Amino acid sequence: SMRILLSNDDGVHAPGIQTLAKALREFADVQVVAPDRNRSGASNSLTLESSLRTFTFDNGDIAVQMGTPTDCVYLGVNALMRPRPDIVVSGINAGPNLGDDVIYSGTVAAAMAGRHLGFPALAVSLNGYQHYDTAAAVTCALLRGLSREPLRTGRILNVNVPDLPLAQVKGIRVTRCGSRHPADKVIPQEDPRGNTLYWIGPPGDKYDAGPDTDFAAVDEGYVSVTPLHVDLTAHSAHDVVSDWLDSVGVGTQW
Amino acid sequence: SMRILLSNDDGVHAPGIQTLAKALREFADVQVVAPDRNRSGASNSLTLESSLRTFTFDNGDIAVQMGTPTDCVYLGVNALMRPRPDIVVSGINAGPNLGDDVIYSGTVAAAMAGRHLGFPALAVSLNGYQHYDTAAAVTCALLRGLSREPLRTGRILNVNVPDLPLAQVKGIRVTRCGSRHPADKVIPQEDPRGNTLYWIGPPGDKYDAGPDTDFAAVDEGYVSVTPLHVDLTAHSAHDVVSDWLDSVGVGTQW
Ligand SMILES: [Mg+2]
Ligand SMILES: [Mg+2]
């Protein structure tokens, strides 16, 4: 009955999106529009300079060739899926999307692209690689919840599932995004001709990971549910910025 | 005296970043780490699957080959620039970065990557293609302001400059991000073999563009300054989401 646009950032060949597709197919109409390769770190990137080609597999799965997760959802909703989906579900990602990492997340971005549909979009990420079935079960519960009663406020739900058997999941926590210290590591590596190439290093250590953060919930064995929005305004900085400008005389003659 | 990491998303061959480099060089030490091509829509994407090669031009400008604006700033701060920069400036972009478009913006993303440095990073975008000198002048004023007195709160400043002679700029407004209606257009286009390719269409119409939004300030001929943060949490949705979960019985047996 429910029309689900299913995407991810790991690609069409990810167990995560496959497991979830099979699970969601049990009770809903599902359509897989996904990248052709691992587009981790793709964030909210989208293809503007080129048009997009859509490669279909035997099972019906639509890849978008060179496509970003945002491209996939954009095409899914406006072009490919008829009738238009009720919800976008993104995942299950192999790996967590927590804290300030969510801005870099293609999984999150796919969900953010579905923010205007009738149901809040779900980004679903597993804190590891083992228990997709656990994350599938959590995803299905939320969808079951959405069918029972619509979520009035909150247009995106960032969901992170501990890499545990479902029996060991302690429950669900409504959380806020934590944050890390700045990532400072670059990993240099020479090419055969001696030229120095650079790899982006690991993330910074956790900084803001308290009582109520997505980090802490997951570390404790709870599902973290964070409502997300696309408004990047640091609203609490408004007055400080205004007073600063006046104090330094920028934008005023006096 | 001031150490500036200068990046963009238009590329090394953009007049925008060139104009600003020459202008900033008048009073500060500037280093251009930028993409090799037009990476508009690159958002906060970053290269994880590959290491990165850095192409230097005669004038000193460092391109990062296949590099995203985030890659450029990441490498700039942690690897390339010694001593470490005091600030990241990103722009001047050819085109506005306003409203909910900022999540897709490589220009903004480059600035967000510099959020941990001693000075708030600046993303600078021109509402058109003509008056880079105007945007350069606004950028220099803000930097002049920062040298006079440090900005206590707000780690990123999204700056949008009307495409006007400086004399016609009305002043500066501290704004919040506006928003648009959902973008719904896809532009189909056949390839020589008859296959249908899809272009991402134009943005949706402005929805939230009032008294205090970045959209309205720019339309009125003011510089818009929006403090941005990387926290995507829709904080006001917290209680609604929690009550919803309990009501539908997800995460509770009862
Ligand atoms: Mg991934
Ligand atoms: Mg651009």
- Angle, helices A238-248 vs B132-148, to 10°: value is 90
Is the Cβ–Cβ distance between B63 and B34 less than 8 Å? yes
3-class secondary structure per residue, A42-78: CCCCCCCCCCEEEEECCCCCEEEECCCHHHHHHHHHH
Closest-CA distance of chain A to residue B154, Å: 5
Domain count, chain B: 1
CATH number for the domain that contains residue B249: 3.40.1210.10
Site of tokens 């959380």: A175
| Domain span holding position A105 | 1-254
- CB < 8 Å to A155, chain B: 234
d(CA A221, CA A203): 22
d(CA A253, CA B117): 29
The amino acid at residue A101 is: D
Report the b/e string of A87-124 with b at 16+ CB within 10 A: bbbbbbbbbbbbbbbbbbbbbbbbbbbbbebebbbbbb
d(CA A24, CA A90): 12
Report the b/e string of B150-182 with b at 16+ CB within 10 A: ebeebbbbbbbbbbbeeeebeebbbbbbbbbeb
Is the Cβ–Cβ distance between A4 and A20 less than 8 Å? no
Method of determination is X-ray
CB contact under 8 A, A226 and B233: yes
Altogether, the residues listed in chain B come to a count of 254
At residue A45's C-alpha, the angle toward residues B88 and B236, to 5°, is 80
Residue A104 three-state SS? helix
CB contact under 8 A, B252 and A171: yes
Is the Cβ–Cβ distance between B72 and B46 less than 8 Å? no
- Angle, helices B132-148 vs B15-25, to 10°: value is 40
For A111, the token pair is 């969900």
For A36, the token pair is 């052709």
For B208, the token pair is 């939230």
Among the bound ligands, the one closest to the CA of A41: 1
Closest CB to A41: pick one of B45, B153, B155: B45
Closest CB to B43: pick one of A45, A52, A241: A45
Is the Cβ–Cβ distance between A165 and B229 less than 8 Å? no
In order of A6, A32, A118, B163, B250, the CA distances from A25 in angstroms are: 11, 11, 20, 51, 20
How many CB atoms sit inside 10 A of residue A50's CB? 10
Interface test with chain A among B88, B223, B233, B242, by most A beta carbons within 10 Å:
B233
The amino acid at residue B7 is: S
The amino acid at residue A141 is: A
Q: Where are the beta strands (DSSP E) in B74-135?
A: 87-94, 121-127
For A73, phi and psi rounded to 5 degrees? -75, -40
Ligand 1 centroid–CA A96 distance in Å is 9
d(CA A233, CA A239): 13
- CB < 8 Å to B229, chain A: 232-234, 237
In order of A53, A79, A85, A251, the CA distances from A82 in angstroms are: 18, 8, 8, 51
CB contact under 8 A, B71 and A200: yes
Is the Cβ–Cβ distance between B93 and B107 less than 8 Å? yes
For B218, the token pair is 């720019």
d(CA B30, CA B90): 12
**Binding-site residue positions of A for a divalent metal cation:** 9-10, 40, 93
Site of tokens 């290491």: B51
Residue B188 three-state SS? strand
Residue B187 three-state SS? strand
What spatial distance separates the first Cα and last Cα of chain A, rounded to whole Å? 64
Closest-CA distance of chain B to residue A93, Å: 16
For B133, residues 6+ apart whose C-beta sits below 8 A from its C-beta are B19, B23, B166
Is the backbone peptide bond immediately before A172 cis, with ω within 30 degrees of 0? no
d(CA A91, CA A7): 6
CB contact under 8 A, B231 and A47: no
